[PDB]
Paper text:
Severe acute respiratory syndrome coronavirus 2 (SARS-CoV-2) is decorated with spikes, and viral entry into cells is initiated when these spikes bind to the host angiotensin-converting enzyme 2 (ACE2) receptor. We set out to design high-affinity protein minibinders to the SARS-CoV-2 spike receptor binding domain (RBD) that compete with ACE2 binding. Unlike antibodies, the miniproteins do not require expression in mammalian cells, and their small size and high stability may allow formulation for direct delivery to the nasal or respiratory system.
Cryo–electron microscopy shows that the structures of the two most potent inhibitors are nearly identical to the computational models. The large amount of data collected in protein-interface design experiments such as those described here should inform the improvement of the detailed atomic models at the core of Rosetta design calculations, as well as complementary machine-learning approaches, to enable even faster in silico design of picomolar inhibitors such as LCB1 and LCB3.
Author numbering:
A (entry chain B): 27 to 66, 81 to 140, 166 to 172, 188 to 196, 200 to 210, 216 to 242, 264 to 298
B (entry chain E): 1 to 64
C (entry chain B): 943 to 991
D (entry chain A): 299 to 620, 641 to 676, 690 to 694
Amino acid sequence: AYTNSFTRGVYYPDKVFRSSVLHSTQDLFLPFFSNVTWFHNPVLPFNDGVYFASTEKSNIIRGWIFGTTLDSKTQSLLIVNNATNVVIKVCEFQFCNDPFCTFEYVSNLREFVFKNYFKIYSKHTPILPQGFSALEPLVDLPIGINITRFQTLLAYYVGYLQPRTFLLKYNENGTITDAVDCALDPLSE
Amino acid sequence: NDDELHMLMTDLVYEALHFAKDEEIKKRVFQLFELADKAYKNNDRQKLEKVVEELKELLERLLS
Amino acid sequence: SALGKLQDVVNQNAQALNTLVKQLSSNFGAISSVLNDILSRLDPPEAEV
Amino acid sequence: TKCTLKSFTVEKGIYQTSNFRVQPTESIVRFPNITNLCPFGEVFNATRFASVYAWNRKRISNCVADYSVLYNSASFSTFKCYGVSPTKLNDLCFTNVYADSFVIRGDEVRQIAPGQTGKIADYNYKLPDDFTGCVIAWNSNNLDSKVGGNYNYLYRLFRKSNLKPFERDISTEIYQAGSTPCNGVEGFNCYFPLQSYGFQPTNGVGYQPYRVVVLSFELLHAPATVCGPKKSTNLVKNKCVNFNFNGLTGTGVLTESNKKFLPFQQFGRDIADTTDAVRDPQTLEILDITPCSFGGVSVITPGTNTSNQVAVLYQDVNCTEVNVFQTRAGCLIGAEHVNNSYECDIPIGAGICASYQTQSIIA
Ligand SMILES: *[C@@H]1O[C@H](CO)[C@@H](O[C@@H]2O[C@H](CO)[C@@H](O)[C@H](O)[C@H]2NC(C)=O)[C@H](O)[C@H]1NC(C)=O
Ligand SMILES: *[C@@H]1O[C@H](CO)[C@@H](O)[C@H](O)[C@H]1NC(C)=O
Ligand SMILES: *[C@@H]1O[C@H](CO)[C@@H](O)[C@H](O)[C@H]1NC(C)=O
Ligand SMILES: *[C@@H]1O[C@H](CO)[C@@H](O)[C@H](O)[C@H]1NC(C)=O
Ligand SMILES: *[C@@H]1O[C@H](CO)[C@@H](O)[C@H](O)[C@H]1NC(C)=O
Ligand SMILES: *[C@@H]1O[C@H](CO)[C@@H](O)[C@H](O)[C@H]1NC(C)=O
Ligand SMILES: *[C@@H]1O[C@H](CO)[C@@H](O)[C@H](O)[C@H]1NC(C)=O
Ligand SMILES: *[C@@H]1O[C@H](CO)[C@@H](O)[C@H](O)[C@H]1NC(C)=O
Ligand SMILES: *[C@@H]1O[C@H](CO)[C@@H](O)[C@H](O)[C@H]1NC(C)=O
């Protein structure tokens, strides 16, 4: 099962304020109108980076596991949202087949971007729905961790980021309100 | 000193292999290393010195 | 579009200035496009390069 | 004007001779309330260092990094910096600093540098050609050496290939020197890849142990967390000042703005990528940055054949910053502004001309 990503997967590439300007940037973004895998648990490839989104009323999804083996042996990054905060650890955790130290940190359509150090961007909006918004960084995790695969801990969508060129439009208040994927089609070029 | 000599030996082994353009040279250098390694472990000063002098000549031939 | 002949001149000149200014952000092989940063990192003989 | 035109006799007209620049009167420095000191003591005064084959990479962040403590101690035999001068480390602020800790022989210290080769540079600890940071090392003969030999320090002698920059290889797989597989077993042309250092108190200097700490400094388009031992000053607005905001420096006038930065943004840029706004790292207010006024300076003169009296035009700039007449072309000083409109003689700009009349210069 796949859905249309439309124009989602755009985020603020840096922490610089800009306004009333079109800025050309090169970064890992979800390509416009690409396919995202629709899940409704498995270990998935991480590739260059991951676009993750969910549509929930019961708020079942709690977190993610990132790593190479996800089975002790080496370090894995465990990010879990529990009760009032988010707990992040990089221990050599032994995980279950059906789950649900050098660093430790403690902090409806929900969009997230997980990319490599490891940065997390997100956006939470009321209601994969069509429309445009940009995601913003909420945590910077300075972790020397090798991530090739990840697992979602409990519908959600998974896409992959590519070294794609974008032209981003900043409004008067510095919010990205529109964007062009420079390799989508000849008109965008 | 035997430990200083052992360190000299391994420096010569590295360089001798580094400049060992052919395979026969590498083979001889590895054999020399092994002999020195055994001599070191058994505290045989004369065998360790012998290998070091041989490695020095070998490297000089590779460099000059 | 009737007055495009005057607007074209304005656009060409404005574009020339934007092009010139944006060149200041280029490194040209330097460690940094910002002169003030070079001078805040390197000593005289290295900064000169 | 005479020097500009390389002439003793100057003809009637307006000439550009120089440039006016408003100068900074003070320097404002602002940092967040970080009273934490960077744990260099835990690196440099550590009781134990890692083996070179398995070096210890410790990340330094969210602290005050005083490098005069290390640089001027004279306890170090080596203090070599690349991409940065060792005396400016206190002025710079970094996204982070990495302290790579290990023990090698004195003769091997020369290999801890960008562009170098040797068994350490190639098989144990490789620095990139574009390495930025400082390599600090000192004699540890009275710390690590033991009378019977300290063999707790290992280095790699054999490997299948060279290391990539900052690659850490701690594999113990038996090295195959010959043509047949070793299958994890030492023997004919099969060797354990790591050797020990025979560190003894009686060794000559080349064979004495040295403790090496490599401080890799990252200077990226990101906020600093490691910042030098600098004090914060009072914030000054509406004046030409020098400034330093967490390592972000320049010269300009700062004013309170109505720009609304997002919660994660630290500074802003205009349409030509020039900094034009900053979030003060203490009170978190947003200030605009506008450059200190400048402009060409032109001398308006009757020919020196008639008079040596001149008027000076400061282009663009206000008279509040420089017979003072403010006009569209700039601040005109020395010419008398009159009601009577005459035929233009020496043009100034924006409808204004000047002349020498019953005598003095008028505009
Ligand atoms: C992260 O770990 C993976 C292994 O889980 C590394 O991938 C292996 O790399 C070696 C050497 O090129 C290959 O021979 C293996 O076949 C690869 N295995 C897999 C599953 O891809 C990967 O290179 C590591 N990445 C980093 C940056 O360390
Ligand atoms: C998405 O997958 C379907 C097959 O289910 C395919 O027909 C469609 O072209 C794909 N779209 C994109 C953008 O890859
Ligand atoms: C969440 O789990 C962590 C352990 O990983 C625990 O320390 C923390 O108190 C828990 N928080 C809540 C709100 O239950
Ligand atoms: C900027 O924010 C103000 C509220 O302070 C709002 O009225 C205005 O419409 C916003 N501008 C844009 C372009 O969204
Ligand atoms: C290490 O200890 C010495 C003791 O004399 C002290 O002077 C020096 O500042 C200390 N170094 C660090 C980084 O704390
Ligand atoms: C620093 O301390 C002052 C009080 O002296 C306080 O007003 C300010 O908000 C503090 N700033 C930070 C970043 O902690
Ligand atoms: C310039 O000075 C000379 C005297 O050397 C005089 O004869 C001439 O008339 C003067 N010309 C003007 C314009 O004042
Ligand atoms: C000079 O500054 C005053 C305010 O003190 C302002 O009213 C005036 O318009 C300014 N003139 C110019 C040319 O900027
Ligand atoms: C023009 O004349 C009026 C008086 O009628 C005077 O107030 C004004 O200052 C004069 N303008 C100049 C530039 O002298």
